[PDB]
């Protein structure tokens, strides 16, 4: 059925994203979350939010090009507010405040 195709497609997103995380890619892995934007609407918000948190954590743990990471997180919050996902943008801000915690920017974090 289609659910199996979505499952193998999601494990192919974790696979390709894992290979891009191994090859040290920043703009491609950062743009993959923007490329999978229409694909997340075909399934529930639980797996979509869990995938955004997964690729977000695995994308921030690489510690590469931290300048576009905060702006990309702001685009993910803007997109989550555009699609009216409260918990998604709440998790995105819950990780972004940790990004400001690592950046030692205590004004907008608090």
**Is the distance from CB of 92 to CB of 52 less than 8 angstroms?**
yes
Task: Identify which of 83, 82, 77 has the alpha carbon closest to the alpha carbon of residue 96.
Answer: 77
Distance CA(73)–CA(2), nearest Å, equals 30
**Is the distance from CB of 24 to CB of 64 less than 8 angstroms?**
yes
Distance CA(88)–CA(37), nearest Å, equals 13
């Amino acid at each position: 059925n289609d659910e199996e195709a979505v499952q193998v497609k999601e494990q192919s997103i974790l696979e390709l994203g894992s290979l891009l995380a191994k090859t040290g890619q920043a703009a491609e892995l950062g743009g993959l979350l923007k490329y999978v934007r229409p694909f997340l609407n075909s399934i529930s918000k639980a797996k979509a939010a869990r995938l955004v948190r997964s690729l977000l954590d695995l994308f921030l743990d690489m510690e590469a090009a931290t300048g576009q990471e905060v702006e990309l997180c702001l685009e993910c919050i803007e997109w989550a507010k555009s699609e009216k996902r409260t918990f998604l943008r709440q998790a995105l801000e819950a990780r972004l405040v940790s990004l400001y915690f690592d950046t030692k920017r205590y004004q907008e974090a608090l």
